[PDB]
């Protein structure tokens with residue numbers, strides 16, 4: 141049978157393919173993660189059906205009820221066989237689902253304007269005039285929520301106190317805020333690179349604040365996890381992942 | 390108590406400098422030693438460090454398919470963990486398990502400063518400047534296996550000149566760069582260590598590929614996923630970055 145693959149719209153990883161005529165099935169989608177999935181299927185010999193996660197979320201756990209949502213929740217409940225998306229491999233997620241080895245490596249950094257005196261997270265933390273934030277309940281926000289590093293703890297105190305005003309619901313919302321207010325956006329370096337290639341007034345500020353990878357998610361114990369790892373390593377060694385990144389970035 | 394196989398390689402694993410001979414685990418320090426200590430704390434195991442007898446990381450014989458090095462120790466259940474700058478590669482992942490990466494890196498080029506050489510392509514299209522890699526390591530194996538024209542050409546060069554351009558260690562490669570017209574294909578994390586210590590040397594071009602180092606375990610080992618979770622904990626609390634800063 142075909143594997144059910146859960147994913148989510150996020151440029152340039154997953155988007156709706158443009159066509160003058162209606163599109164159906166997997167043909168509706170394109171992007172880096174779609175090429176990846178195609179290449180994985182070519183190596184491993186499975187067929188698949190792409191489905192957008194209904195709740196539009198990656199996967200985080202609620203504090204009170206301990207319930208998961210998003211693509212992670214779909215894998216937990218065995219409603220999908222794989223999740224293929226820019227899904228960060230994190231400690232809390234690894235506790236509840238399995239991940240392939242990374243197909244991309246990245247870190248949190250800062251998206252802001254060029255030509256300013258701001259050069260690091262510490263510069264942001266020490267002031268309040270320039271607002272800053274992150275996608276609510278994502279891996280980036282979770283990093284700040286849990287950090288014991290003085291600088292990042294202060295940034296979390298700032299963001300948490302202004303939740304409604306500085307946390308956003310998507311990368312697109314955060315980017316639009318950098319573009320239309322005095323705002324710096326804490327976001328993943330791979331997506332920053334995409335943005336800065338297309339917006340000459342924007343830049344990454346400072347280096348990477350942490351390090352993580354994106355991996356393909358599976359339900360805990362899935363036999364596909366290790367198979368997908370091996371295929372990913374093959375794709376990397378063949379230069380195919382690099383070609384795919386060049387194509388979409 | 391777990392048996393941990395490793396290998397000397399600066400600054401991952403070193404013999405501690407000492408007036409008197411040291412014994413057992415006391416003999417060793419380095420990034421990978423700190424990593425092992427941190428893992429042991431999180432997971433609650435004791436361990437004995439043993440240097441791999443054959444001094445190899447792990448490659449497969451092209452005729453008989455047998456493995457050597459730390460990979461062989463794991464396959465043979467002579468060790469529980471391998472903790473070293475052991476690249477997570479397609480061929481190795483097929484026979485042993487690896488944790489998720491504690492360090493990410495890629496192949497690049499170590500050469501002298503001030504030349505017009507700017508990329509692998511520049512090396513491949515000539516022969517006056519010799520180049521090579523550590524024999525049978527993950528770098529050499531990338532070239533051996535690559536279908537990319539430039540890298541296949543470089544493999545043809547290095548292959549045909551095995552005796553003279555392939556080396557036994559990073560140290561031998563670095564000395565070649567310093568004493569002759571030679572460029573050394575080597576891992577970018579080691580290049581970084583080297584170029585911080587020698588201002589006449591530089592990385593040429595960017596990364597040619599991307600890989601990680603991971604802790605190795607025998608296939609099927611229950612420790613693999615526990616070590617992965619520990620590594621993720623160490624990364625998220627900033628410890629892996631501090632460890633790299635400390636040793637580089």
Ligand SMILES: C=C(C)[C@H]1CN[C@H](C(=O)O)[C@H]1CC(=O)O
Nearest residue numbers: 198226227228278279280327328
């Ligand atoms: C696109 C966003 C919502 C996702 C993508 N990776 C992160 C994740 O896996 O949670 C989130 C971004 C972030 O937290 O900066």
Ligand SMILES: C=C(C)[C@H]1CN[C@H](C(=O)O)[C@H]1CC(=O)O
Nearest residue numbers: 446474475476526527528575576
């Ligand atoms: C120090 C060397 C021999 C090891 C380290 N990592 C690679 C490996 O895991 O094979 C080798 C280096 C290289 O191949 O450039």
Ligand SMILES: [Cl-]
Nearest residue numbers: 240241488489
């Ligand atoms: Cl894994």
